[PDB]
Design an enzyme around this catalytic site. Structure first.
Site, PDB file in Angstrom:
ATOM      1  CB  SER A   1       0.395   4.346  -6.408  1.00 60.97           C
ATOM      2  OG  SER A   1       1.774   4.652  -6.380  1.00 60.97           O
TER       3      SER A   1
ATOM      4  CB  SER B   1      -0.911  -0.002   1.221  1.00 60.77           C
ATOM      5  OG  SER B   1      -1.842  -1.069   1.141  1.00 60.77           O
TER       6      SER B   1
ATOM      7  CB  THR C   1      -3.638  -0.913  -1.663  1.00 61.04           C
ATOM      8  OG1 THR C   1      -4.540  -1.620  -0.804  1.00 61.04           O
ATOM      9  CG2 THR C   1      -3.589   0.595  -1.354  1.00 61.04           C
ATOM     10  CB  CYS C   2      -0.245   1.072  -5.089  1.00 56.79           C
ATOM     11  SG  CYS C   2       0.413   1.826  -3.596  1.00 56.79           S
ATOM     12  CG  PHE C   3      -1.376  -0.810  -9.440  1.00 51.38           C
ATOM     13  CD1 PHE C   3      -0.778   0.430  -9.599  1.00 51.38           C
ATOM     14  CD2 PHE C   3      -0.580  -1.946  -9.468  1.00 51.38           C
ATOM     15  CE1 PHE C   3       0.588   0.542  -9.770  1.00 51.38           C
ATOM     16  CE2 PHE C   3       0.792  -1.846  -9.644  1.00 51.38           C
ATOM     17  CZ  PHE C   3       1.377  -0.600  -9.795  1.00 51.38           C
TER      18      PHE C   3
END
Length: 403
Positions: free
Chosen positions: A355, A206, A377-379
């Site tokens: 992100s 994350s 999470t970041c994508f």
């Protein structure tokens, strides 16, 4: 140094900077980076005006968490104190006034029926943003466009940063005690610390996808334990990989920000004992602080994209059925599992960020049918494996998110 600024000297001999064109001060030298962020952040402070109406629509309910939250609200409505507590602020001084007035008081008086003066929901909302003002140096983000809040390791630039983190601590706790929702944007790893839980390698994804990927392949000091391909230079071997990953993961979560985090907790605890959150997990805790929004499925569905799947694909069709059967709390819990947070932006699912920039929700065919769904999470990416029976997915979906 740009026009309008001077480099003054406080009576203790330290150097700060005064921006006479905005009647501001800061402890930081006015980099072209600083004028950039301050100019940007103030452009976002202006839009905060309208977004308070949307914020009003956040809610909580009028062992489960519907349970646990009434147990908590009772523990607060009981340890409460009589009378009132009065805070007075003006719009160009919400932060300065709030700060000086809350740190003056003994922490318990913050548990009286707080009377803001100039509005409470407005105050918590506004002040929850006023503390991210770059002027104060306390925070940095991990992605483009304000994505992933973090304590700034260089906060020490500001000689008083530990006092500010204590005030945020106190402030976040007043919100929990008096039941108001904030909008600062702490990550789950930060709530995990408020609960004395250890952030894990999955959590790193994350916060640092690239750093996480390094630890994924093949699994201290200025980054001790030697790798190629205590101990100032003890070689990393296959017969000590496990401990390297464990020590280095912890390092990425704590480095540069250990004093600031202690001071935050010290400030939180004074007002509301951190052990009052024994029951809750990291996601349930972000819920209380932030408030629930009603998830609407039609919005979610037009704004979700696909990889190797399509709108009519078999499991993508079973996915949305499990959602419709889900209640809003489970919907938000699905939301958190996949984006990192219960907070949906003003535009709707159409406008969720990530992100690397804007990033709609994404379900991807990945993994063997014996796996649980994974997220990135970041994508904002959901990995729904090619499952075979709708009830199998139902089991694996509702299991992946409740852990």
């Amino acid at each position: 140094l740009p026009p309008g600024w001077e480099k003054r000297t406080d009576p203790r001999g330290r150097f700060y900077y005064v921006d006479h064109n905005t009647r501001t001060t800061t402890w930081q030298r006015p980099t072209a980076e600083y004028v950039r962020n301050y100019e940007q952040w103030q452009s976002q402070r202006n839009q905060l005006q309208g977004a308070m109406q949307h914020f009003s629509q956040r809610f909580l309910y009028q062992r489960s968490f519907r349970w646990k939250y009434h147990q908590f609200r009772f523990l607060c409505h009981s340890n409460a104190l009589p009378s009132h507590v009065k805070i007075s602020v003006s719009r160009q001084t919400l932060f300065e006034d709030s700060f000086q007035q809350i740190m003056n008081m003994k922490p318990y008086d913050l548990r009286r029926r707080l009377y803001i003066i100039m509005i409470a929901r407005e105050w918590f909302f506004l002040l929850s943003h006023e503390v991210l003002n770059p002027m104060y140096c306390l925070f940095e983000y991990a992605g483009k466009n304000n994505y992933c809040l973090q304590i700034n390791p260089a906060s020490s630039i500001n000689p008083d940063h530990l006092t500010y983190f204590r005030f945020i601590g106190r402030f976040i706790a007043m919100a929990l005690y008096h039941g108001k929702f904030i909008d600062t944007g702490f990550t789950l790893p930060f709530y995990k610390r408020m609960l004395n839980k250890r952030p894990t390698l999955k959590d790193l994804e994350s916060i640092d996808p690239e750093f996480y990927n390094s630890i994924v392949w093949i699994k201290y000091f200025i980054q001790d334990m030697e790798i190629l391909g205590g101990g100032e230079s003890i070689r990393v071997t296959e017969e000590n990989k496990e401990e390297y990953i464990m020590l280095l993961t912890d390092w990425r979560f704590t480095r540069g920000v250990e004093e600031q985090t202690k001071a935050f907790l010290d400030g939180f605890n004074e007002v509301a004992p951190l052990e009052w959150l024994r029951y809750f997990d990291e996601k349930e805790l972000e819920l209380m602080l932030c408030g629930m929004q009603e998830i609407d499925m039609s919005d979610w569905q037009k704004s979700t994209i696909y990889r190797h799947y399509t709108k009519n694909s078999k499991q993508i069709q079973w996915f949305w059925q499990v959602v419709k059967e889900m209640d809003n709390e489970k919907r938000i819990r699905l939301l958190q599992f996949v984006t990192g947070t219960c907070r949906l932006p003003v535009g709707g699912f159409a406008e969720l960020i990530g992100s690397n920039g804007p990033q709609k929700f994404c379900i991807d065919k990945v993994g063997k049918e014996t796996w649980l769904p994974r997220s990135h999470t970041c994508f904002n990416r959901l990995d729904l494996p090619p499952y075979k029976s709708y009830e199998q997915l139902r089991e694996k979906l509702l299991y992946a998110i409740e852990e």
